[PDB]
């Protein structure tokens, strides 16, 4: 399950060594009407970069994209498609920008093609600067 690292990982705020005779998970409201998912409150995972159970504050911009890869752990890369307008030829051109977003494990089931809504936060790594806020399941794909 959890505690698969050298250090004992735990939510740094809650105190789990009160004298007795389960555990009070910590989770915060994220704001902007984003409903904290059920598993972020009932699940027992521990991630410091989760927007619901970690020390990251969502701010700045709120974008959206589509998932393309998940081989990276705790992190996926989405693809933002847009149309750049060139003045001379009064036309457009498809352009794409793939960015790496942190996927907190509160979103258990999410596949390639699902549309996620990301939110800017402080730099989590060398390239990651966004966090997955909500996951809209792809078109159809009810099977």
């Amino acid at each position: 399950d959890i505690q698969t690292e050298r250090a004992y990982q735990k939510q740094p705020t809650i105190f789990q060594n009160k004298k007795r005779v389960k555990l009070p998970r910590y989770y915060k409201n994220i704001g902007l009407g984003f409903k904290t998912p059920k598993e972020a409150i009932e699940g027992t995972y521990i991630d410091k970069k989760c927007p619901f159970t970690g020390n990251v504050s969502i701010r700045g911009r709120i974008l959206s994209g589509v998932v393309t890869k998940m081989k990276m752990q705790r992190t996926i890369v989405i693809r933002r498609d847009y149309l750049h307008y060139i003045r001379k030829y009064n036309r457009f051109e498809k352009r794409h920008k793939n960015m790496s977003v942190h996927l907190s494990p509160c979103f258990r089931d999410v596949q390639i093609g699902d549309i996620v809504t990301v939110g800017e936060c402080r730099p989590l790594s060398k390239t990651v600067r966004f966090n997955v806020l909500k996951v809209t399941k792809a078109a159809g794909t009810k099977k």
Binding site: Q3, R6, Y8, K10, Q16, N17
Partner: peptide, 12 residues
């Protein structure tokens, strides 16, 4: 160290 955290590091 106490409780689970203490018990964890003893295992390590």
């Amino acid at each position: 160290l106490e409780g689970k955290e203490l018990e964890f590091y003893l295992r390590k």
